[PDB]
Amino acid sequence: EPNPAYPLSDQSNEGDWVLNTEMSDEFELPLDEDKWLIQGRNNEYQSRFIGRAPSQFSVNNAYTESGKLKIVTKWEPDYDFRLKFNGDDHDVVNGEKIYFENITTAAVISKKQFRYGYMEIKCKSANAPITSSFWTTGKNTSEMDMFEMFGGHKTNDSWRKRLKFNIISWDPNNPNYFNKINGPVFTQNIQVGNNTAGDFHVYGFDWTADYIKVYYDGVLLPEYTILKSELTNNNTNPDKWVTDSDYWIWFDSETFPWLGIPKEEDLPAEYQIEYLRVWQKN
């Protein structure tokens, strides 16, 4: 059996790793809401993000069970869907009003932040046309989407094995700012050999000032390594490196309406997180 004190990919502890306890959770107890924000709890919304239409985050769809954090996607047409903070009952996406209806998901966000570390999540994505995501934000700095999975994609088997990885700039001073370029600074489709919804797997993201590396079930996936020297072209384009920020960690599920929408028969579905281990260098 592997030693849980160290990253599955670094069992000899070459990294001299120490668990960051305020960012980590084995989810063996009821969810600690002094450690984790259930999005919407007491009307608190990280990033003022109530959900991606048609879905909305529900405080009842996040809880621990059987040793796992559960992010639950439900068909709940009678849910009391709220307005966005801007007053709208819809998102506007590619010219279309997409109304909030039918589906509730959840988002769980760390109440603490950290900068740099080995992030290891053991999880099974929701088996429906819904995302299961593991990501970060910092306040008007940037966002790393370690993965967006879509475990129950009905028509694209590649998506069933995909971790969509993104880096997004939230800094209006940055030429790669999301509301300037309307897209990520960097994106790649991490493809693993097994359906993300089929079983639990261990995903590792080693985040440093100079690189980000991806690990699957303890093994480096070198095809997906991100180097600061490459993204910035040897520091000639430094604004392309935006991940030197303190981050909150998010787990959530969302409808991506243009990718797919679940049927009632697909639901409920669960994005199950057996644990999150975040280590930092001693």
Ligand X SMILES: O=S(=O)(O)O[C@@H]1[C@H](O[C@H]2O[C@@H]3CO[C@@H]([C@H]3O)[C@H]2O)[C@@H](O)[C@H](O[C@@H]2[C@@H]3OC[C@H]2O[C@H](O[C@@H]2[C@@H](O)[C@H](O[C@@H]4[C@@H]5OC[C@H]4O[C@H](O[C@@H]4[C@@H](O)[C@H](O)O[C@H](CO)[C@@H]4O)[C@@H]5O)O[C@H](CO)[C@@H]2OS(=O)(=O)O)[C@@H]3O)O[C@@H]1CO
Q: What is the DSSP string of 151-206?
A: TT-SS-HHHHTEEEEEEEE--TTSTTBHHHHSS-SEEEEEE-SS-TTTS-EEEEEE
If one asks whether residue 131 binds ligand X (CB under 6 A), the answer comes out as yes
Q: What is the DSSP letter of 22?
A: T
If one asks whether residue 168 binds ligand X (CB under 6 A), the answer comes out as yes
Name where the chain breaks: residue before each gap, C-N > 2.5 Å: none
For residue 273, which of 251, 257, 258 has the smallest C-alpha distance? 251
If one asks whether residue 144 binds ligand X (CB under 6 A), the answer comes out as no
Map residues 225-254 to x or -, x wherever contact with ligand X holds by CB under 6 A: -----------------------------x
Distance of alpha carbon 30 from alpha carbon 275, whole angstroms: 13
Give the binding range for ligand X (CB under 6 A) out of 115-123, 132-140, 196-204, 233-241. Answer: 132-140
Q: Three-state DSSP class for 41?
A: helix
If one asks whether residue 189 binds ligand X (CB under 6 A), the answer comes out as no
Among 166, 176, 195, 196, binds ligand X (CB under 6 A): 166
Q: What is the smallest separation between the CB atom of 231 and ligand X, expressed in angstroms?
A: 17
Our CA dihedral for 250, 146, 23, 218, rounded to 10 degrees, sits at 140
Whose Cβ is closer to ligand X: residue 8's or residue 273's? Answer: 273
Map residues 45-74 to x or -, x wherever contact with ligand X holds by CB under 6 A: --xxx--x----------------------
Among 102, 133, 169, 272, binds ligand X (CB under 6 A): 133
- Point out which residues bind ligand X (CB under 6 A): 47-49, 52, 131, 133, 135, 137-140, 143, 145, 148, 166, 168, 170, 254
